[PDB]
Amino acid sequence: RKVLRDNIQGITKPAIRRLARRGGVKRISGLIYEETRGVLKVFLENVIRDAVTYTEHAKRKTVTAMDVVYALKRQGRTLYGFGG
Amino acid sequence: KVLRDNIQGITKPAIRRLARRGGVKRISGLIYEETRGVLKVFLENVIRDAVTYTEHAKRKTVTAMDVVYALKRQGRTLYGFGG
Amino acid sequence: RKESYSIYVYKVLKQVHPDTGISSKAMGIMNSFVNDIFERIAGEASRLAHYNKRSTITSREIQTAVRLLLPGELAKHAVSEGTKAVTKYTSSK
Amino acid sequence: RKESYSIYVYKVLKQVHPDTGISSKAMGIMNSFVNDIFERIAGEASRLAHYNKRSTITSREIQTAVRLLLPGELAKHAVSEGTKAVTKYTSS
Amino acid sequence: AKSRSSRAGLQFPVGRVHRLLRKGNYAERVGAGAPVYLAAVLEYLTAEILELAGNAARDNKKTRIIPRHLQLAIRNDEELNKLLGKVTIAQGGVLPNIQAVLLP
Amino acid sequence: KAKSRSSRAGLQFPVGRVHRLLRKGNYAERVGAGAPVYLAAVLEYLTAEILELAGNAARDNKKTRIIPRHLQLAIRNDEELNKLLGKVTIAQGGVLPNIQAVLLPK
Amino acid sequence: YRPGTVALREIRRYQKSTELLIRKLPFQRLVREIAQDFKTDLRFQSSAVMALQEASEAYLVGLFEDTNLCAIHAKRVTIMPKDIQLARRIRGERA
Amino acid sequence: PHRYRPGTVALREIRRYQKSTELLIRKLPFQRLVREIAQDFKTDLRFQSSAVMALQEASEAYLVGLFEDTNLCAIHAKRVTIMPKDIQLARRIRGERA
Ligand SMILES: [Cl-]
Ligand SMILES: [Cl-]
Ligand SMILES: [Cl-]
Ligand SMILES: [Cl-]
Ligand SMILES: [Cl-]
Ligand SMILES: [Cl-]
Ligand SMILES: [Cl-]
Ligand SMILES: [Cl-]
Ligand SMILES: [Cl-]
Ligand SMILES: [Cl-]
Ligand SMILES: [Cl-]
Ligand SMILES: [Cl-]
Ligand SMILES: [Cl-]
Ligand SMILES: [Cl-]
Ligand SMILES: [Cl-]
Ligand SMILES: [Cl-]
Ligand SMILES: [Cl-]
Ligand SMILES: [Cl-]
Ligand SMILES: [Cl-]
Ligand SMILES: [Cl-]
Ligand SMILES: [Cl-]
Ligand SMILES: [Cl-]
């Protein structure tokens, strides 16, 4: 129990670069790292908000993989591999 | 054999107007044919599904609702034809 | 084939804009809207009940469906209206 | 909370590649794949039954749903495969 | 209040909504509160779009809402726009808007 | 001992289980006897197609055990499967090796 | 006036309008032709043809909007096929 | 082929990463971001590890997909360097900020 803060900063320049590389990007402007952090936070907040809604609906305190899969499906994304 | 090319019935000025409604200021002469191509693909996909609904129901007349159901299959929701 | 809610849409229109009318084409759009939202909410409530192995769809499933389907702010208002109606309905059981 | 089809996917794998195996991570993906498709097909068959005021989902709704949901050739073979199955089941 | 709608303080049809929920392949059973909650949400969202389309009608000196006003109301409201993002309103047109770079 | 419904239909996928799953989901008031046979057959066919292509992808990489990566390669390299699964993310599937020509040297 | 001035005038006029822009009959004949290649002897309720046209026109205008953004992005004011292709690739409509 | 300039390096990197399937964001920091975000929505909320991993697989798949579209946008402007406007255009057309 500690108030977490500023962890968006854990999404580092090298992590972001590795992601762009997998995405086939050959060169990266220095301004994309902060931009990327912003889009990632939006995506995560939305998915996490929905996953917890499923969690609380079921009156649980522990978010499960299936709660996330349902939440992603909500965003029109189908995730394979976590139905176990 | 016979010539079935009704897609050419879709006019250049009609396409120009659609593009203007879409806020386009200047149009290359090449986009007209390109536009006919994507429109034909769009209609083929929706009409194929609409008639699949019609046949399934063992009907011969495609209804507005068949098109609406077909549009939904395409991720598009159309309002106004449920009456 | 789709439900008609014309009479109700019309009554709501009189409450919010007493001296404004609505055209037949607009009423058709409104009917499509109501049917669409009804289906999205029931559909998600059905998924919730099955996900939780619940045989009954209750107001809790409708409420959760609403929070999942509507953008944040709008959901707050809808949830409040939903809750109020249920409260009045019970207090007058 | 989702169905496991592992045994069955193992059996099919051997009919197709007796030689090759499959990791558990991959089996997890195959299970997600079967449940997904099962759900898409049944959901659409349900919609079809409702649209036509029919109380029963039959192999006809399943077939139409398959036509609507699968792309081109994959839909043709699936329909063919479904039909064969029902034909043989009906006979035997 | 005699009807279920009346008992709930609503204009939308509670009885009818209960019937539609039961008739629709949603669950084995449907509790009594489900349709009142759903009817209330439908009524509220209906009031929202009507309030806003009504305003748009006035902004053009009209006294009758037509599809165009429903489209203007939805597209000018961030929340309704998100809710109805894949919806096409027959005869609604688009929002008047030109990219700045295109103006002289 | 009774012959399984799958057996009678010439399938590996569980007709009996499929019929029960169809009833558990409340998709309609009733579920006809042929529905689960047709459905089971489609699930099997699709499973066979993917295993087929994935097994291949595993060979092309001197591998004998199919992993997520192979399923991804099989799906993304098949025009119809790739369209069927366009909004699907395969965990640990990676991406197809592909660089825009414009970025490669002359 | 300048073609630019005329174009801008047209945008304002068509963005204020809600009327369908493709001709009724030519659209109807297009629909019939396509349906014919799937199942012959098929007829269309007239409101079904209209639903198709309202959807087809909404779709195309939506596509022109994205197409336009793609032209502006490349510092051009003239849309070209490559703009439509980029928009469609990103919308996921093609490959 | 240019010989070992930064471009040659970027290209080796693209090949390296398009070949692997491992997650690219460090796991503990990602987990901390997830928990931090959840602190708003609710106090005393726990995440199963596979739920965190599910979120990470989905987040990275989303980001690299976004970067692929972004890259096409940059290439469209006859550019090889991606910039914020490329991301914003891709998102606009995707309907994420349309
Ligand atoms: Cl950093
Ligand atoms: Cl770089
Ligand atoms: Cl799953
Ligand atoms: Cl025309
Ligand atoms: Cl022009
Ligand atoms: Cl009140
Ligand atoms: Cl009532
Ligand atoms: Cl209830
Ligand atoms: Cl069973
Ligand atoms: Cl059973
Ligand atoms: Cl049957
Ligand atoms: Cl391959
Ligand atoms: Cl390559
Ligand atoms: Cl549409
Ligand atoms: Cl230009
Ligand atoms: Cl071009
Ligand atoms: Cl294209
Ligand atoms: Cl990893
Ligand atoms: Cl932690
Ligand atoms: Cl995903
Ligand atoms: Cl550059
Ligand atoms: Cl920029």
Instruction: Determine how β-strand B61-62 pairs with β-strand G43-44.
Output: parallel
Query: Is-contact A67 H51, C-beta < 8 A?
Result: yes
The minimal CB distance from G30 to the residues B18, B27, B43 is found for B43
Interface test with chain E among F23, F26, F30, F87, by most E beta carbons within 10 Å? F26
The minimal CB distance from E27 to the residues F26, F28, F29 is found for F26
Residue G14 Cα distances to A34, B14, B32, E101, angstroms: 39, 11, 18, 19
CA A15 – ligand 18 centroid, Å? 13
Give CA–CA dist C22/C35, Å, rounded: 18
**What is the number of structural domains in chain C?**
1
Interface test with chain F among D31, D57, D80, by most F beta carbons within 10 Å? D57
Cα within 13 Å of Cα(A3), Cβ side: 1
Instruction: Specify the CATH number of the domain F1-106.
Output: 1.10.20.10
DSSP readout, C25-81?
HHHHHHHHHHHHHHHHHHHHHHHHHHHTT-SEE-HHHHHHHHHHHS-HHHHHHHHHH
Instruction: Determine how β-strand A78-80 pairs with β-strand D56-57.
Output: unpaired
Would you state the torsion angle of the CA atoms of residues D12, D16, D18, D24, taken in this order, to the nearest 10 degrees? -50
Cα distance between the two ends of chain F: 70
CA angle C68, C73, C75 (to 5 degrees): 40
Q: What letter represents residue A71's amino acid? A: A
Q: Which own/partner pairs from A56-59 qualify as long-range (CB within 8 Å, at least 24 positions apart)? A: A56/H42, A57/C48, A57/C52, A57/C60, A57/C61, A57/C64, A58/C51, A58/C52
- Which CATH fold topology does E1-104 show? Histone, subunit A (1.10.20)
CA G4 – ligand 22 centroid, Å? 27
DSSP H or E run through E5: helix E4-8
**What is the number of structural domains in chain G?**
1
The minimal CB distance from D85 to the residues F27, F41, F83 is found for F41
DSSP readout, chain F?
----HHHHHT-SS-HHHHHHHHHHTTSSSEE-SSHHHHHHHHHHHHHHHHHHHHHHHHHTTT-SEE-HHHHHHHHHTSHHHHHHTTTEEETT--------GGGS--
Q: What is the resolution of this structure in A?
A: 2.2
Token readout for A13 is: 């320049």
* Chains touching F (3+ CB pairs < 8 Å): A, C, D, E, G, H
Give CA–CA dist D10/B59, Å, rounded: 43
Domain extent, residue H77, equals 1-98
Token readout for D80 is: 């063919």
Sheet strands (E) in A19-84? 27-28, 62-63, 78-80
Interface test with chain H among G69, G72, G73, G91, by most H beta carbons within 10 Å? G73
Token readout for B53 is: 């609904």
Token readout for C43 is: 């559909």
Residue H1 Cα distances to A22, F100, F105, H16, angstroms: 21, 15, 5, 18
Q: Do G90 and H94 touch (CB under 8 A)?
A: yes
Give CA–CA dist C21/E89, Å, rounded: 19
Give CA–CA dist B29/E61, Å, rounded: 40
* Short-list E45, E31, B68, CA closest to C8: E45
Domain extent, residue D57, equals 1-92
**What is the number of structural domains in chain B?**
1
CATH of the domain at A38: 1.10.20.10
Instruction: Enumerate helices (H) and strands (E) in chain D, giving the number of each.
Output: 4, 2
CATH of the domain at G47: 1.10.20.10
**Elucidation method:** X-ray
The answer to whether residue G89 neighbours chain H at the CB level (below 8 Å) is yes
Instruction: Determine how β-strand H81-82 pairs with β-strand A78-80.
Output: unpaired
Residue with tokens 């389309």: E53
Domain extent, residue A84, equals 1-84
